Amino acid sequence: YDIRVRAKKQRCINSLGINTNGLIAMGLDRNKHDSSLQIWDMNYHDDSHETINPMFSYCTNESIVSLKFLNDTSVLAASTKFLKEIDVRSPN
Amino acid sequence: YDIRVRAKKQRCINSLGINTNGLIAMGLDRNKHDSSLQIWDMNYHDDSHETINPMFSYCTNESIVSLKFLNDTSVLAASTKFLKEIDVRSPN
């Protein structure tokens, strides 16, 4: 098909990763009131809205400039000052 | 395998539904501080804890006594006084 989606706050998408199990992550620029690593599934997305509803949100007030999906659960994200590895089964 | 899971507050599981896309719902008794329709995926469950982390929570202060998965997104839940149909793509 063809679907346009965006964050709650509209800002540049630096990085993008689509996993094997359909899970989609997003790397955005720096916004103090929104997460820069929003991970969600397209199967649970309401088609009536452009904004996404993220299952997992990380990296508030940061600028995720690169990300990669290592496996079905963990994501290796890179900010402008840090190099992170985030697992969706943990909040840390 | 074999995994035992439970709600944050331990109470009787009246109803249970496992969907085709791996999504699992749960019908519990009445607790005023916890949801009685907790929907989650087993792929994003931390194996180090017994308590579940629900992606979608509904029906607080109710006793879900029967539930059924109509399709990949909507669930037809039944409380002790109401008959509901809840879609996970909407908060209503």
mmCIF file of N, CA, C and O in Angstrom, chain A residues 23-75:
data_model
loop_
_atom_site.group_PDB
_atom_site.id
_atom_site.type_symbol
_atom_site.label_atom_id
_atom_site.label_comp_id
_atom_site.label_asym_id
_atom_site.label_seq_id
_atom_site.Cartn_x
_atom_site.Cartn_y
_atom_site.Cartn_z
ATOM 1 N N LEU A 23 8.281 -4.949 13.460
ATOM 2 C CA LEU A 23 8.425 -3.836 14.387
ATOM 3 C C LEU A 23 9.279 -2.745 13.749
ATOM 4 O O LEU A 23 10.340 -3.027 13.185
ATOM 5 N N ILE A 24 8.815 -1.499 13.833
ATOM 6 C CA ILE A 24 9.431 -0.374 13.139
ATOM 7 C C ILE A 24 9.896 0.651 14.166
ATOM 8 O O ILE A 24 9.111 1.083 15.018
ATOM 9 N N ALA A 25 11.166 1.038 14.080
ATOM 10 C CA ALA A 25 11.751 2.084 14.907
ATOM 11 C C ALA A 25 11.952 3.352 14.086
ATOM 12 O O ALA A 25 11.791 3.364 12.864
ATOM 13 N N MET A 26 12.312 4.430 14.779
ATOM 14 C CA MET A 26 12.428 5.749 14.167
ATOM 15 C C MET A 26 13.430 6.589 14.939
ATOM 16 O O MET A 26 13.342 6.691 16.165
ATOM 17 N N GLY A 27 14.375 7.189 14.221
ATOM 18 C CA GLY A 27 15.298 8.126 14.828
ATOM 19 C C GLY A 27 15.023 9.555 14.408
ATOM 20 O O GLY A 27 15.094 9.880 13.220
ATOM 21 N N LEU A 28 14.715 10.416 15.368
ATOM 22 C CA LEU A 28 14.353 11.801 15.110
ATOM 23 C C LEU A 28 15.411 12.743 15.671
ATOM 24 O O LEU A 28 16.380 12.325 16.312
ATOM 25 N N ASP A 29 15.213 14.034 15.422
ATOM 26 C CA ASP A 29 16.117 15.064 15.913
ATOM 27 C C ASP A 29 15.782 15.376 17.372
ATOM 28 O O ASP A 29 15.010 14.670 18.026
ATOM 29 N N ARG A 30 16.355 16.452 17.901
ATOM 30 C CA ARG A 30 16.237 16.761 19.319
ATOM 31 C C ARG A 30 14.965 17.562 19.573
ATOM 32 O O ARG A 30 14.811 18.674 19.059
ATOM 33 N N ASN A 31 14.055 16.991 20.360
ATOM 34 C CA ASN A 31 12.900 17.715 20.874
ATOM 35 C C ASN A 31 12.742 17.391 22.349
ATOM 36 O O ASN A 31 12.766 16.219 22.736
ATOM 37 N N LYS A 32 12.585 18.432 23.166
ATOM 38 C CA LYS A 32 12.594 18.267 24.613
ATOM 39 C C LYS A 32 11.323 17.616 25.147
ATOM 40 O O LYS A 32 11.337 17.095 26.266
ATOM 41 N N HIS A 33 10.232 17.626 24.383
ATOM 42 C CA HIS A 33 8.958 17.100 24.856
ATOM 43 C C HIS A 33 8.553 15.804 24.169
ATOM 44 O O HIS A 33 7.411 15.362 24.333
ATOM 45 N N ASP A 34 9.449 15.182 23.407
ATOM 46 C CA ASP A 34 9.097 13.982 22.665
ATOM 47 C C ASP A 34 10.309 13.069 22.591
ATOM 48 O O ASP A 34 11.453 13.524 22.669
ATOM 49 N N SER A 35 10.045 11.778 22.435
ATOM 50 C CA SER A 35 11.106 10.790 22.331
ATOM 51 C C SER A 35 11.696 10.771 20.926
ATOM 52 O O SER A 35 10.996 10.977 19.931
ATOM 53 N N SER A 36 13.001 10.514 20.854
ATOM 54 C CA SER A 36 13.707 10.431 19.584
ATOM 55 C C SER A 36 13.935 8.999 19.125
ATOM 56 O O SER A 36 14.547 8.791 18.073
ATOM 57 N N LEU A 37 13.460 8.010 19.880
ATOM 58 C CA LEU A 37 13.485 6.610 19.458
ATOM 59 C C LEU A 37 12.100 6.039 19.741
ATOM 60 O O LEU A 37 11.833 5.531 20.833
ATOM 61 N N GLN A 38 11.218 6.136 18.753
ATOM 62 C CA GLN A 38 9.843 5.676 18.874
ATOM 63 C C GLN A 38 9.696 4.367 18.111
ATOM 64 O O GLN A 38 9.898 4.328 16.894
ATOM 65 N N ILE A 39 9.346 3.302 18.825
ATOM 66 C CA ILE A 39 9.231 1.967 18.253
ATOM 67 C C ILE A 39 7.767 1.554 18.323
ATOM 68 O O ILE A 39 7.141 1.644 19.387
ATOM 69 N N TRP A 40 7.222 1.102 17.194
ATOM 70 C CA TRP A 40 5.814 0.739 17.124
ATOM 71 C C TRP A 40 5.624 -0.334 16.061
ATOM 72 O O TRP A 40 6.517 -0.612 15.257
ATOM 73 N N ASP A 41 4.439 -0.936 16.068
ATOM 74 C CA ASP A 41 4.032 -1.916 15.073
ATOM 75 C C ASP A 41 2.968 -1.298 14.178
ATOM 76 O O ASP A 41 2.080 -0.585 14.655
ATOM 77 N N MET A 42 3.062 -1.572 12.874
ATOM 78 C CA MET A 42 2.101 -1.027 11.921
ATOM 79 C C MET A 42 0.744 -1.718 11.988
ATOM 80 O O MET A 42 -0.246 -1.154 11.510
ATOM 81 N N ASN A 43 0.673 -2.917 12.566
ATOM 82 C CA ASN A 43 -0.592 -3.636 12.658
ATOM 83 C C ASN A 43 -1.524 -3.031 13.699
ATOM 84 O O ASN A 43 -2.740 -3.227 13.612
ATOM 85 N N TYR A 44 -0.984 -2.303 14.674
ATOM 86 C CA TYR A 44 -1.770 -1.661 15.720
ATOM 87 C C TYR A 44 -1.795 -0.145 15.548
ATOM 88 O O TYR A 44 -1.883 0.599 16.528
ATOM 89 N N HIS A 45 -1.718 0.319 14.306
ATOM 90 C CA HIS A 45 -1.730 1.738 13.985
ATOM 91 C C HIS A 45 -3.092 2.120 13.423
ATOM 92 O O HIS A 45 -3.564 1.508 12.459
ATOM 93 N N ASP A 46 -3.717 3.125 14.029
ATOM 94 C CA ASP A 46 -4.992 3.633 13.539
ATOM 95 C C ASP A 46 -4.783 4.388 12.233
ATOM 96 O O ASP A 46 -3.992 5.336 12.176
ATOM 97 N N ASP A 47 -5.489 3.969 11.180
ATOM 98 C CA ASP A 47 -5.308 4.578 9.867
ATOM 99 C C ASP A 47 -5.927 5.965 9.765
ATOM 100 O O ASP A 47 -5.701 6.652 8.763
ATOM 101 N N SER A 48 -6.699 6.391 10.763
ATOM 102 C CA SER A 48 -7.380 7.677 10.728
ATOM 103 C C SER A 48 -6.503 8.830 11.200
ATOM 104 O O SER A 48 -6.954 9.980 11.161
ATOM 105 N N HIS A 49 -5.277 8.561 11.641
ATOM 106 C CA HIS A 49 -4.390 9.598 12.149
ATOM 107 C C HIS A 49 -3.008 9.455 11.531
ATOM 108 O O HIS A 49 -2.541 8.341 11.276
ATOM 109 N N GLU A 50 -2.361 10.596 11.288
ATOM 110 C CA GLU A 50 -0.991 10.596 10.788
ATOM 111 C C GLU A 50 0.018 10.286 11.888
ATOM 112 O O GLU A 50 1.029 9.623 11.635
ATOM 113 N N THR A 51 -0.235 10.760 13.108
ATOM 114 C CA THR A 51 0.700 10.552 14.205
ATOM 115 C C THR A 51 0.715 9.096 14.657
ATOM 116 O O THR A 51 -0.313 8.415 14.659
ATOM 117 N N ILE A 52 1.900 8.624 15.042
ATOM 118 C CA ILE A 52 2.107 7.243 15.460
ATOM 119 C C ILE A 52 1.875 7.129 16.959
ATOM 120 O O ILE A 52 2.039 8.089 17.717
ATOM 121 N N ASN A 53 1.484 5.931 17.388
ATOM 122 C CA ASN A 53 1.367 5.602 18.805
ATOM 123 C C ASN A 53 2.456 4.603 19.168
ATOM 124 O O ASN A 53 2.329 3.408 18.858
ATOM 125 N N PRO A 54 3.539 5.029 19.814
ATOM 126 C CA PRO A 54 4.681 4.132 20.009
ATOM 127 C C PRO A 54 4.468 3.178 21.175
ATOM 128 O O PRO A 54 4.007 3.565 22.252
ATOM 129 N N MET A 55 4.805 1.909 20.938
ATOM 130 C CA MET A 55 4.811 0.925 22.016
ATOM 131 C C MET A 55 5.960 1.171 22.986
ATOM 132 O O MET A 55 5.786 1.057 24.204
ATOM 133 N N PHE A 56 7.137 1.509 22.468
ATOM 134 C CA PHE A 56 8.311 1.774 23.286
ATOM 135 C C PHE A 56 8.899 3.109 22.864
ATOM 136 O O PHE A 56 9.132 3.340 21.674
ATOM 137 N N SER A 57 9.141 3.980 23.838
ATOM 138 C CA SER A 57 9.732 5.289 23.600
ATOM 139 C C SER A 57 10.992 5.441 24.437
ATOM 140 O O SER A 57 10.991 5.133 25.632
ATOM 141 N N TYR A 58 12.062 5.916 23.804
ATOM 142 C CA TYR A 58 13.338 6.114 24.472
ATOM 143 C C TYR A 58 13.967 7.402 23.967
ATOM 144 O O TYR A 58 13.517 7.994 22.982
ATOM 145 N N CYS A 59 15.018 7.826 24.675
ATOM 146 C CA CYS A 59 15.922 8.902 24.265
ATOM 147 C C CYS A 59 15.198 10.244 24.120
ATOM 148 O O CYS A 59 15.151 10.844 23.046
ATOM 149 N N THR A 60 14.632 10.708 25.229
ATOM 150 C CA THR A 60 14.041 12.036 25.252
ATOM 151 C C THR A 60 15.146 13.082 25.338
ATOM 152 O O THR A 60 16.174 12.867 25.989
ATOM 153 N N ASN A 61 14.911 14.223 24.680
ATOM 154 C CA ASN A 61 15.865 15.336 24.590
ATOM 155 C C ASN A 61 17.209 14.878 24.025
ATOM 156 O O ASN A 61 18.273 15.255 24.519
ATOM 157 N N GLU A 62 17.160 14.050 22.986
ATOM 158 C CA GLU A 62 18.361 13.605 22.296
ATOM 159 C C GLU A 62 18.089 13.604 20.800
ATOM 160 O O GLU A 62 16.949 13.758 20.358
ATOM 161 N N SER A 63 19.143 13.401 20.014
ATOM 162 C CA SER A 63 19.044 13.367 18.556
ATOM 163 C C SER A 63 19.622 12.051 18.049
ATOM 164 O O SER A 63 20.828 11.940 17.819
ATOM 165 N N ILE A 64 18.755 11.057 17.874
ATOM 166 C CA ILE A 64 19.176 9.750 17.375
ATOM 167 C C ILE A 64 19.521 9.891 15.895
ATOM 168 O O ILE A 64 18.650 10.172 15.069
ATOM 169 N N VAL A 65 20.798 9.702 15.559
ATOM 170 C CA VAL A 65 21.273 9.914 14.194
ATOM 171 C C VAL A 65 21.525 8.611 13.447
ATOM 172 O O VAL A 65 21.688 8.641 12.215
ATOM 173 N N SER A 66 21.557 7.474 14.140
ATOM 174 C CA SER A 66 21.697 6.178 13.494
ATOM 175 C C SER A 66 21.138 5.113 14.425
ATOM 176 O O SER A 66 21.311 5.198 15.643
ATOM 177 N N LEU A 67 20.473 4.116 13.846
ATOM 178 C CA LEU A 67 19.960 2.995 14.620
ATOM 179 C C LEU A 67 19.972 1.743 13.758
ATOM 180 O O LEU A 67 19.932 1.810 12.527
ATOM 181 N N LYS A 68 20.028 0.593 14.425
ATOM 182 C CA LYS A 68 20.062 -0.691 13.741
ATOM 183 C C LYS A 68 19.425 -1.745 14.634
ATOM 184 O O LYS A 68 19.582 -1.706 15.857
ATOM 185 N N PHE A 69 18.707 -2.678 14.017
ATOM 186 C CA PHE A 69 18.023 -3.748 14.737
ATOM 187 C C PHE A 69 18.934 -4.968 14.783
ATOM 188 O O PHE A 69 19.162 -5.620 13.759
ATOM 189 N N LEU A 70 19.462 -5.274 15.970
ATOM 190 C CA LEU A 70 20.346 -6.426 16.109
ATOM 191 C C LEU A 70 19.569 -7.733 16.019
ATOM 192 O O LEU A 70 19.994 -8.669 15.332
ATOM 193 N N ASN A 71 18.432 -7.812 16.697
ATOM 194 C CA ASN A 71 17.609 -9.014 16.696
ATOM 195 C C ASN A 71 16.154 -8.584 16.847
ATOM 196 O O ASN A 71 15.810 -7.422 16.609
ATOM 197 N N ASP A 72 15.294 -9.527 17.238
ATOM 198 C CA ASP A 72 13.864 -9.268 17.343
ATOM 199 C C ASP A 72 13.497 -8.319 18.478
ATOM 200 O O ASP A 72 12.368 -7.817 18.492
ATOM 201 N N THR A 73 14.397 -8.056 19.413
ATOM 202 C CA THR A 73 14.003 -7.250 20.564
ATOM 203 C C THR A 73 14.905 -6.048 20.805
ATOM 204 O O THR A 73 14.409 -4.995 21.208
ATOM 205 N N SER A 74 16.206 -6.168 20.568
ATOM 206 C CA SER A 74 17.141 -5.113 20.930
ATOM 207 C C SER A 74 17.435 -4.218 19.733
ATOM 208 O O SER A 74 17.431 -4.662 18.583
ATOM 209 N N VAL A 75 17.693 -2.944 20.020
ATOM 210 C CA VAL A 75 18.033 -1.953 19.005
ATOM 211 C C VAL A 75 19.304 -1.234 19.445
ATOM 212 O O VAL A 75 19.477 -0.920 20.628
#
